[PDB]
Design an enzyme around this catalytic site. Sequence first.
Site, PDB file in Angstrom:
ATOM      1  N   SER A  41     -24.298 -37.326  22.814  1.00 15.54           N
ATOM      2  CA  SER A  41     -24.022 -36.255  22.448  1.00 15.54           C
ATOM      3  C   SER A  41     -23.585 -35.064  23.373  1.00 15.54           C
ATOM      4  O   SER A  41     -22.879 -34.441  24.024  1.00 15.54           O
ATOM      5  CB  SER A  41     -24.910 -35.262  21.845  1.00 15.54           C
ATOM      6  N   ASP A  97     -19.088 -27.218  17.102  1.00 14.82           N
ATOM      7  CA  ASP A  97     -20.369 -27.424  17.320  1.00 14.82           C
ATOM      8  C   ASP A  97     -20.848 -26.171  16.495  1.00 14.82           C
ATOM      9  O   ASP A  97     -19.970 -24.962  15.711  1.00 14.82           O
ATOM     10  CB  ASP A  97     -20.786 -27.395  18.410  1.00 14.82           C
ATOM     11  N   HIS A 123     -26.090 -28.387  20.531  1.00 17.68           N
ATOM     12  CA  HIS A 123     -26.835 -27.887  21.333  1.00 17.68           C
ATOM     13  C   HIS A 123     -25.407 -27.932  21.571  1.00 17.68           C
ATOM     14  O   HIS A 123     -24.837 -27.538  22.957  1.00 17.68           O
ATOM     15  CB  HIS A 123     -26.967 -29.503  22.398  1.00 17.68           C
TER      16      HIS A 123
END
Length: 265
Positions: free
Chosen positions: A202, A13, A42
């Site tokens: 997500s 990420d 996130h």
Amino acid sequence: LKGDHNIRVAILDGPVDIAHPCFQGADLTVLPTLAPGFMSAHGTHVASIIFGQPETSVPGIAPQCRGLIVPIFSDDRRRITQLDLARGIERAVNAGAHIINISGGELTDFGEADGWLENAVSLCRQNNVLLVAAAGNNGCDCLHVPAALPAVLAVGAMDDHGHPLDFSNWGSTYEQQGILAPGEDILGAKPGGGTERLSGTSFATPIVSGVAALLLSEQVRRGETPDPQKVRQLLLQSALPCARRCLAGRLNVSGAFTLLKGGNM
């Protein structure tokens, strides 16, 4: 029932705030950011869902697992290319990941991908590494990559009452390799401190990655070699009916553990 430090879960990420209070005591290794969508953006929240410590502001699903934080960016402001993601996946495989969590994805025609990414995902399949990826939030008969690629576990979002959320993508390939996991108001850490509940595929994705890690951790306890791709099969085989929007079914942790021990549901 909280994981095993021999089971390695990679978060692929954007930036992750590893100084957040919920990671104090977590077993987290951050791979360095290299020289020069797929990033959920996130990263902190996603990571907290798995590795947040008991008694902290975010209790994680597998707080005793070994975490690998893998940047899929060189500059966090630039579009993440398929090569950026592919290289991140390869770095995670090379670091010994059992599970690779990708909470991002891109919308496609029918799950096509270019060579670098296809090859990186095949490497996971060849090496018995489980990629778990977000189905996408376009609310249509639609597929994201890497979620729709072979041997990937795609993750859609259902609400507190076990119904698919309207935004969660339901393209047909997900019927064979996708499951619904909780994705409404999921608690996680905010970068810079504090917590918040957010909705989306997500956030459903790391729930599944965490459950997969717990299943692998139980294999260790049983004296069996951890088998990430069998764990994918068990999560799919144990998924409960809700029709197309149900994917292969709803995440069923007790059923998955029953199948893990060769039981029947």
